[PDB]
Design a protein around this ligand. Sequence first.
Ligand SMILES: Nc1nc2c(ncn2[C@@H]2O[C@H](COP(=O)(O)OP(=O)(O)O)[C@@H](O)[C@H]2O)c(=O)[nH]1
Ligand SMILES: [Mg+2]
Lengths: 195, 165
Amino acid sequence: QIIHHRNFQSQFDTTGNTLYNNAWVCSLNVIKSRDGNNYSALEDITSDNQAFNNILEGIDIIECENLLKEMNVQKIPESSLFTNIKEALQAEVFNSTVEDDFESFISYELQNHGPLMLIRPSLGSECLHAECIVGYDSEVKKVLIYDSMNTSPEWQSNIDVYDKLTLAFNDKYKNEDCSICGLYYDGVYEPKPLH
Amino acid sequence: TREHLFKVLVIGELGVGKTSIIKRYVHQLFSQHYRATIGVDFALKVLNWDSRTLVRLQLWDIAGQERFGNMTRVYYKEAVGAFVVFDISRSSTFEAVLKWKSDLDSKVHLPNGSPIPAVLLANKCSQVDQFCKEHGFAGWFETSAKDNINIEEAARFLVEKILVN
Ligand SMILES: Nc1nc2c(ncn2[C@@H]2O[C@H](COP(=O)(O)OP(=O)(O)O)[C@@H](O)[C@H]2O)c(=O)[nH]1
Ligand SMILES: [Mg+2]
């Protein structure tokens, strides 16, 4: 229903046989770029950065925390819907009303604050991961996900994206007091008028 | 010529060596230090299985969920193999094997109704007691992440079983 035209980048190489830890680069490039172009992150990655194009590990938490400030990437503002979702994530419920609020929370943020980046614990690794929410479709109840681990953008179900938000907002899963986990957005994003 | 993408889960109780097995197999590395970083959602190993077939192997570390035992849909989704890991020289983790295996077979299975191949890994380097394989394990290995003794062969055994399906 509502989709942002943002370019997709994979943290795999062209042949697909190499997995770089570039999720932090790809995710940042999604929310900072516009009109399907690439953001001028060449200055950060190309500058002999040990985190870029690395097989072993990516960027450090404390280093990435500063990087987000430099690039004007803040955590999404507080809101009532956001509180409802977080309260539901702590209980891990996903009934009819929680999904109604999820639909409203996703669709509001994408309209008013643009694409969102999700810093969350990785599902299959002891590190953190970054993926982006770029659109939503209220007819099929799906949300457009930019996950650099995949080959392309994917329309993933709300229950599946909800289960992934849980990792970032439920103390059961986030450990070592990693305060960098959460939902981010581009600070210089300017929403279009409603009418 | 063919190319395969296989997703396998590495599950087990805390402190058995799940991450060290993945770290040894994928990165040729075994270290004691830890770096909190932002990188990938899982690990990848690519194998030139034979002259025509190529296998891309995704190793999904259970990671935090290990402390609770229950698996989320987004984690076990579409898994075709599994490594159930326990710590030998510690009886506490061998008891939990049956708990991890039962939870595995109930959540994910083959598209034809059969259980996914699962290999039991006795990490940190009794042999008559391979009757535990009656629980649905395709095989077992004595592995060591420090010395790299059987992790290579244990992985090829799982890929082989997956490739028959
Ligand atoms: N001696 C020995 N120690 C190991 C081996 N594998 C893991 N460890 C140790 O077991 C501890 C925890 O292992 P870990 O990788 O965290 O297992 P996990 O918690 O299930 O992911 C670490 O301090 C390792 O040094 C091994 O093959 N040999
Ligand atoms: Mg571990």
